[PDB]
Amino acid sequence: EKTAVVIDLGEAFTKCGFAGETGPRCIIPSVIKKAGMPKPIKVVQYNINTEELYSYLKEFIHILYFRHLLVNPRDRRVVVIESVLCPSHFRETLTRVLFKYFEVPSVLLAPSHLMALLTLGINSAMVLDCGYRESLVLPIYEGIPVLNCWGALPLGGKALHKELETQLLEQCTVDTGQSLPSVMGSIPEGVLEDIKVRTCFVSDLTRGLKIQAAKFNRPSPPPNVDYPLDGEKILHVLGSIRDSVVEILFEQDNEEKSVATLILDSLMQCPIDTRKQLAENLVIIGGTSMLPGFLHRLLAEIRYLVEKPKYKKTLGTKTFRIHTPPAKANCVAWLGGAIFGALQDILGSRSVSKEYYNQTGRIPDWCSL
Amino acid sequence: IANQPVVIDNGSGVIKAGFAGDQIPKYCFPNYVGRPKHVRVMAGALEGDIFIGPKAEEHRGLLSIRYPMEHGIVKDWNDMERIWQYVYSKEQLQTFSEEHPVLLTEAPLNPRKNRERAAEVFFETFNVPALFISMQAVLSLYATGRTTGVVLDSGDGVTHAVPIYEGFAMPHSIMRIDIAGRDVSRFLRLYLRKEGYDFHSSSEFEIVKAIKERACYLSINPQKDETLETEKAQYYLPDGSTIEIGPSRFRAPELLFRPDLIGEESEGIHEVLVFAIQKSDMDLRRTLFSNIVLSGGSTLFKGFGDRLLSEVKKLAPKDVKIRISAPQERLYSTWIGGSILASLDTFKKMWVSKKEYEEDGARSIHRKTF
Amino acid sequence: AALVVDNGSGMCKAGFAGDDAPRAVFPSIVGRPRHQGVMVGMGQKDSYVGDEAQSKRGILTLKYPIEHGIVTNWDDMEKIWHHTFYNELRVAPEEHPVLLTEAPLNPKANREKMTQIMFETFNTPAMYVAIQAVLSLYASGRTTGIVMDSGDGVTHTVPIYEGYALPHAILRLDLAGRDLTDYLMKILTERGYSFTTTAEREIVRDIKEKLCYVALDFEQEMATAASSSSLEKSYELPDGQVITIGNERFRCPEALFQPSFLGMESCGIHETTFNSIMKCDVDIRKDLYANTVLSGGTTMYPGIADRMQKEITALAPSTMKIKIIAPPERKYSVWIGGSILASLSTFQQMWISKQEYDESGPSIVHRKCF
């Protein structure tokens, strides 16, 4: 009858396509290309002028639906996959742009973790979404997301970018156009993403502990490979640096916090009957989880933290299984929204319509009244 | 050995100390231990790394704070021993533990194991001659001067309501919740993620407590405030950057009356006050409604008492004279009562001596408290 | 032909007439979930019932409709009946007659409302309300004998002699399994095992069923608990966590024999049965002493029949021969009696009909009951 639209906005990338198709049609990055502009500006931003955001969202949606969808969304429904705890200011702006400017029939602002759970096809699961800005945890038990049990450290893609920028600046080795360290003050983000995808090798638990021991009073430094760059300035990036950048994601000491500890804190907050099913079904999604050799380092670190005396008195013996999804780790949240929209013309009714928005005021966020 | 006894008013958020027969506690500071983030190579004997009290308040950015107590129940005992040692040390009291008797405070219906381990610390590590543990509700009534009345209290750890009538504390009429100032601060942090201004670190968590203390107000009608659009008031950080708080300032303390927003089932402040009065005998209910006493820091929100009246009017029987009394010094009400209790001549009979503890043990401490 | 439905406050039991044991057995609970603005995936039930609420316990607010054998929420009780007939039993209520059970000395309006729901909403062809003790005696086989019935709702006693119930010698008691479960949950909190939410109410209930037992002598059992740690058993939860308690096994069901622990100011089950027998006629006491029948789940503690024999002999004269009838199937004795009552041919003329209800109304049931 009518295949609905699926959107999954974010600061780094944006998964978008049709509901029903196994995986999206395209994934253009969040930034936009403007005429007479030095650098490309990011679309998804927080704490900034309302009318400017509205114009930025219109500009991104306009370049999206022609290239991605090849259709007017005026014919059929939309599924805007907002991550839970995405600012209400930003949701209101999205609601305005979809109804006032474009005039869609319906919209939906559903959470990312519940839809990622619909892909697995199980009702209870602990979920971790390691995106660009934050690494958010949220356990779901029998459909309902357990909200007060949660956690989100500023330790996703953006933290890894900042650490790469710091460590490369400290130890730099650029070719002539050899020596000459710290010539350029900063480096672009698109290049630094390509370095993370290709170079950064994720270490094991025993290797990670050896690196942590070396930092505070050297084993397994290799391997190292150079990275090519434009304008005839190749830089000889090292092997110990990229491993040290990955290590800060799992660094416990002096914060009592990490990607692994965040699941245990979420499990601690959850009730006793819910506890065991969440431990059995531990789902990992998001952008940072696509890194090579990540799921072992997490599961081994999780287990090491359970062996510690502080978590034995509550958790103890637990079968931590990581049931992986059908689609890739970044594109699990989108696939869930595509499942939610395509199949059920019935569950399209619960979402907010154009008729309801004009008279009322806004889509209902999880708040009072 | 009858020296001027010390009154250590315990608490998860704040800890207070001084001497008997005083007007206000001279030594008040928050109950936590601070450790440097970027720690040294050794992970055993640290040096120059422990800050308790005003040093820790001064140097927030350096220290990763952690509270030893949670819901009026200590988790980390080594931290509480260091805090008690800091209280007795020359940086605060300038007196020995050997000289003076001790008056400790605890919330009602706590674990007995923690009470025994508390006594073990005071008797053996410190060399106390005599120790006495008491309730928060009984002390608040000593400070006001009354004998009758309910004591609703709301600290950082526990919220509980104990009805007392002419020096008769009713054990089966006690109500208790794990919903308090710390939890209110946790959900204000959760809501400021929805505003945009995310916080994560333990030093950074104290900014959320400062926002809660300063800019929060309880609406009379929560449905009416939701239908209306908020003004989005401002607040300056210690750094400098301005923060539009928005609807999170009024929705944060709503928690205490509506714990359904948590996702964990609790009675709430208003139900606990009614339930404590209802669970007591029929003839005592009207006197308990007339003498309602407030205490703790989470009763200091704007329009809190006005809301707490309206909830009592909704639940309680009609045509009954309600009266939620509250002193000027609500945070210090518990310490003042301890200082008054310590100054009385009966205090010598109530306490647990060191010799009596060595003979009997934990059983004598459980007998003397109740 | 006829259906028997023992609407217990805890376990709602139901099945067919002329059967050994009931088919439909489940806890009478109606768990409604945590209502937050966030959505839920692939549909779900708005209000769960029975074993479904017990399976998905962690989230749902478990509220029992019957409180002390008294139906508080009638919409909740209507959903449980609906769950009994259509889902569990798989048979319509219009075809089969329906035997029901209430405890004696209940509110008169509750039978009328129970009967109204059966005829108006459910459209039953014929119904009856029996006393639980009368059925428990009828399951045991004897016509003569007092029945110390004790469930999670209400403990009560009904002395009967040669098929003649003594309605004025009946003594209803407020103490019951739910009050014992709440007492066990409180004394667990005293030794550092805090259970606040209603999801943990079922775990402590399950702990109460397994570990707890009636003491022969309480002061002796308290002395042995202090000395040795062999009595201290361990119970693992649904979660991998495991806990150990020493004093709380024998101390929990002692509340039946000493109501002073709970704060009820009532007679214990041992002397309540005695007081019931003394209220009867003097000539028919010997047979009531001989046939001291027990029934319900609160009489399934190991060694309860031995404690009843000790206490009743201590109360009564030395010449009397005391004897407690304690069968293996005393947990489901009320339903078995209803099945035997439904199977008899004499009971076919004792039913209420639709035409009789339309003529009279709800007040006809009081004549038919006793």
Swiss-Prot record, chain A:
SUPFAM superfamilies: Actin-like ATPase domain (SSF53067). Keywords: Cytoplasm, Cytoskeleton. Pfam families: Actin. One of its GO terms (cellular component) is dynactin complex. It comes from the Eukaryota. GO terms for biological process: retrograde axonal transport of mitochondrion. Its main location: cytoplasm. Part of the dynactin complex that activates the molecular motor dynein for ultra-processive transport along microtubules. Belongs to the actin family. Subunit of dynactin, a multiprotein complex part of a tripartite complex with dynein and a adapter, such as BICDL1, BICD2 or HOOK3. The dynactin complex is built around ACTR1A/ACTB filament and consists of an actin-related filament composed of a shoulder domain, a pointed end and a barbed end. Its length is defined by its flexible shoulder domain. The soulder is composed of 2 DCTN1 subunits, 4 DCTN2 and 2 DCTN3. The 4 DCNT2 (via N-terminus) bind the ACTR1A filament and act as molecular rulers to determine the length. The pointed end is important for binding dynein-dynactin cargo adapters. This is Actin-related protein 10. The lineage of its organism: Eukaryota, Metazoa, Chordata, Craniata, Vertebrata.
UniProtKB/Swiss-Prot annotation, chain B:
The keyword Magnesium does not apply. It is found in: Cytoplasm, Cytoskeleton; Cytoplasm, Cytoskeleton, Microtubule organizing center, Centrosome; Cytoplasm, Cell cortex. One of its GO terms (cellular component) is dynactin complex. InterPro entries: Actin, Actin/actin-like_CS, ATPase_NBD. Pfam families: Actin (PF00022). Transmembrane segments: none annotated. Gene3D superfamilies: 3.30.420.40, Actin, Chain A, domain 4 (3.90.640.10). GO terms for molecular function: ATP binding. Keywords: Acetylation, ATP-binding, Cytoplasm, Cytoskeleton, Nucleotide-binding. It comes from the Eukaryota. Belongs to the actin family. ARP1 subfamily. Part of the ACTR1A/ACTB filament around which the dynactin complex is built. The filament contains 8 copies of ACTR1A and 1 ACTB. Interacts with dynein and adapters such as BICD2. Interacts with BCCIP (isoform 2/alpha). Part of the ACTR1A/ACTB filament around which the dynactin complex is built. The dynactin multiprotein complex activates the molecular motor dynein for ultra-processive transport along microtubules. This is Alpha-centractin.
